[PDB]
Amino acid sequence: SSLGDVLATLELERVGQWRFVGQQLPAPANHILGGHISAQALLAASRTAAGREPHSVHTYFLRPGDSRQPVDFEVVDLQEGRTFSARRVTARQDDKILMEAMSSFKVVNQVVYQPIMPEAPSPESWASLRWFERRTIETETVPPARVPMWWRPDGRVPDDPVLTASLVAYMSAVTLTEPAFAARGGVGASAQRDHSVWFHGRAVLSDWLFYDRSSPSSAGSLALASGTMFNRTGELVCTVKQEMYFPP
Amino acid sequence: SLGDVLATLELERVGQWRFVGQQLPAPANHILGGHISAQALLAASRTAAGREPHSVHTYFLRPGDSRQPVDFEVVDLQEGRTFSARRVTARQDDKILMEAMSSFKVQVVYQPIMPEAPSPESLASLRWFERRTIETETVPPARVPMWWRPDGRVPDDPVLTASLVAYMSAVTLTEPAFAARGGVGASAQRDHSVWFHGRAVLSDWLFYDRSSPSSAGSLALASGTMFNRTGELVCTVKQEMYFPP
């Protein structure tokens, strides 16, 4: 398990009113994982939004980062309103821009609906990868290649609403390659290009979570991946979309 | 009408990274998301030399005054051999109206199959396009697919075409969410996201599948997939919108 090491790296060091440094964890590559850097960037934005939770976030992964060096996150105030907040986060290593993200926030409480969580057998039946347990429920490789899974963090989580959201985003990104990799026939190196999350309800990480995954489309080198996450109770947690690059 | 739309989408360049876009008369003097995000996408694109957008993410932050023009600043996020990325910030007198990020580039293809539908024949802006409404339901997901084509012939610039796709995909995606609510709630768009697939053919009708999968109180999600009449996927779309209590 590597949850303790993950949680540590997710505790960013503030070096300014709008500036943070995020420690990276060793990877064979050493390639920084999108989900990791976008989770850190989301925390960066969140900490500059006073007692407000993220309801959506859009992240572009622009350049591959060196996980042996830490990452500088600059936050920019796009909007600060009575109801909503908006942030820009730019992640850098030296002069290099690794990713840029936008995120939106509001203060929390009434017309509610969601997709119904698919019936599935209950779950009883790389540092960035090892912090969570997983049960891959069922598999198809022909597009849309639905490969839904059960997952939970391997360890106890502080029950920080904001930390939980970034961990949801964290995991939502790193597990979303496989449906696309499956649809292609596999054996192909890929790079994530962007990640998008819309938050619905608050995640319960003290139990298993259902992460429905698929790859609806691929326009050549670029494949789309789609995701919906549920609490074991069946409440929708987040809706997810991801675009990734496959070099010919 | 199309002529007025095309005119405003042709931005005036005032710098290497700066454009001014004219606005068209709108209800309550407020600018439609689709219009400003399409302008922003064109702003970014004109800073990407002979590259087409494959995706774009736009946040709508403050309502803009459609009686005054808009300043678009473009920022070079990355310029590589294969990919380009841009940030676009739209302002009215230092007020930030929207921000957008977009990505650009210069043998495995798959898509969802286009849904069976009656031919469109067998059946301001926003006024530049014709439309045929296939079916209506108000109970979630409230799928309301439609046929659309421009009311007029478009110049056949691949980049202009994409911005018009994004333009229309945004302004038509409110309805699923509004319907799902029962058609009472006044709304504002919060963000718009487009992933481009195949190149749009605006010389014929296009299939736009629309739905509203979820609503978490004041924030509703809307989802869309657009097809050429041939059944080729043009773009996938997601939109988040705010309904004030």
Side-chain angles (χ1 to χ4, degrees):
Chain A
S1 182
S2 59
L3 189 54
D5 297 334
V6 167
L7 292 177
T9 54
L10 294 188
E11 274 308 294
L12 311 177
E13 194 202 358
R14 186 189 283 266
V15 296
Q17 179 69 358
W18 302 98
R19 288 191 193 267
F20 306 84
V21 187
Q23 288 312 322
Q24 302 308 307
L25 38 76
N30 321 241
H31 176 65
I32 305 174
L33 273 76
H36 176 79
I37 195 162
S38 73
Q40 282 183 328
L42 179 62
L43 285 167
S46 305
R47 289 174 65 177
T48 72
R52 288 182 183 186
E53 287 164 60
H55 64 84
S56 63
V57 55
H58 303 273
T59 311
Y60 267 114
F61 309 109
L62 303 178
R63 237 130 110 74
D66 190 341
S67 57
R68 298 167 298 177
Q69 308 294 116
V71 173
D72 304 318
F73 298 83
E74 178 190 15
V75 184
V76 172
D77 176 19
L78 302 181
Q79 182 215 33
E80 189 64 26
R82 172 57 185 164
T83 313
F84 284 99
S85 295
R87 301 293 185 255
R88 172 192 332 149
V89 176
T90 300
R92 292 177 174 97
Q93 262 172 353
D94 265 86
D95 305 326
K96 204 181 301 163
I97 297 173
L98 309 177
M99 60 132 281
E100 186 147 284
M102 299 185 296
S103 53
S104 187
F105 304 83
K106 60 173 300 211
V107 292
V108 182
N109 197 333
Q110 284 317 94
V111 173
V112 184
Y113 52 82
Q114 57 171 83
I116 309 306
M117 183 190 159
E119 301 177 11
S122 291
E124 300 84 0
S125 319
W126 299 77
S128 347
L129 304 185
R130 294 188 276 103
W131 56 280
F132 57 89
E133 303 178 63
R134 45 188 296 174
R135 300 300 168 241
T136 168
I137 300 169
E138 67 183 17
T139 303
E140 70 183 1
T141 65
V142 168
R146 287 190 59 207
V147 195
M149 73 190 307
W150 287 108
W151 82 279
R152 70 180 175 172
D154 190 24
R156 186 65 66 160
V157 175
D159 191 74
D160 187 345
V162 166
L163 182 50
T164 296
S166 65
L167 284 166
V168 165
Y170 198 142
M171 114 84 36
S172 73
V174 300
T175 58
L176 219 51
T177 39
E178 149 66 8
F181 193 61
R184 271 187 136 66
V187 64
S190 74
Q192 314 197 322
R193 180 54 172 185
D194 55 281
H195 186 74
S196 282
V197 184
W198 300 265
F199 296 98
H200 187 265
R202 222 174 284 187
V204 176
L205 299 178
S206 55
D207 202 352
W208 293 87
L209 292 194
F210 190 94
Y211 194 26
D212 207 5
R213 308 177 296 175
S214 61
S215 188
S217 51
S218 181
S221 48
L222 295 169
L224 269 187
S226 183
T228 22
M229 192 174 300
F230 300 85
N231 287 325
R232 186 164 193 167
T233 63
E235 196 191 14
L236 178 68
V237 167
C238 68
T239 307
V240 185
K241 197 79 76 183
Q242 182 181 126
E243 185 179 44
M244 67 205 77
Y245 176 62
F246 287 89
Chain B
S1 200
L2 190 53
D4 297 334
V5 172
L6 293 178
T8 52
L9 295 188
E10 192 65 33
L11 311 177
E12 194 200 357
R13 186 189 284 267
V14 295
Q16 180 70 358
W17 303 97
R18 288 192 192 268
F19 303 82
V20 183
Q22 291 305 331
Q23 302 308 307
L24 41 76
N29 292 332
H30 283 318
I31 305 173
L32 274 77
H35 179 81
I36 194 161
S37 74
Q39 281 183 327
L41 181 63
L42 285 167
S45 305
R46 289 174 64 177
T47 67
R51 287 183 183 188
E52 287 164 61
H54 62 83
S55 64
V56 51
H57 303 272
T58 310
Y59 267 115
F60 307 107
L61 304 176
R62 300 278 298 278
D65 190 339
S66 57
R67 297 167 298 177
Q68 306 294 317
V70 175
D71 303 317
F72 299 84
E73 180 189 16
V74 185
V75 170
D76 176 17
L77 261 30
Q78 84 142 154
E79 188 65 27
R81 176 57 186 164
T82 311
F83 284 99
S84 295
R86 302 293 187 255
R87 171 185 89 227
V88 175
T89 304
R91 293 176 175 97
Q92 262 174 351
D93 311 288
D94 300 326
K95 203 181 300 288
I96 298 173
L97 309 175
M98 57 127 279
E99 186 147 285
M101 299 183 295
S102 52
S103 186
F104 302 82
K105 60 173 301 211
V106 23
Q107 287 317 93
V108 172
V109 186
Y110 56 84
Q111 56 169 82
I113 307 93
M114 184 188 64
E116 303 175 11
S119 289
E121 294 84 3
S122 61
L123 301 162
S125 87
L126 23 63
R127 189 189 173 86
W128 55 282
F129 58 93
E130 305 177 64
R131 44 188 296 174
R132 299 301 166 78
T133 167
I134 297 169
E135 72 180 18
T136 301
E137 72 181 0
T138 65
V139 165
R143 171 128 96 85
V144 195
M146 71 187 305
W147 287 106
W148 81 278
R149 70 178 177 171
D151 187 24
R153 159 84 42 166
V154 165
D156 192 66
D157 188 346
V159 168
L160 183 51
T161 296
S163 64
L164 284 166
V165 163
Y167 196 140
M168 128 86 193
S169 73
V171 298
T172 59
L173 218 48
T174 41
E175 307 172 16
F178 185 66
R181 272 186 137 66
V184 21
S187 75
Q189 284 172 22
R190 185 60 167 186
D191 58 52
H192 186 72
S193 282
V194 183
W195 301 266
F196 295 95
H197 189 78
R199 223 177 284 187
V201 174
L202 300 180
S203 55
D204 200 351
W205 293 87
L206 291 99
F207 190 93
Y208 195 27
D209 207 7
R210 307 176 296 175
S211 64
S212 189
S214 51
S215 180
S218 48
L219 295 170
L221 270 185
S223 183
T225 22
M226 192 174 300
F227 301 85
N228 289 326
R229 188 163 194 166
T230 60
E232 194 190 12
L233 179 69
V234 165
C235 69
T236 306
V237 184
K238 198 138 291 187
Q239 181 180 125
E240 185 179 44
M241 65 205 76
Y242 178 63
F243 288 89

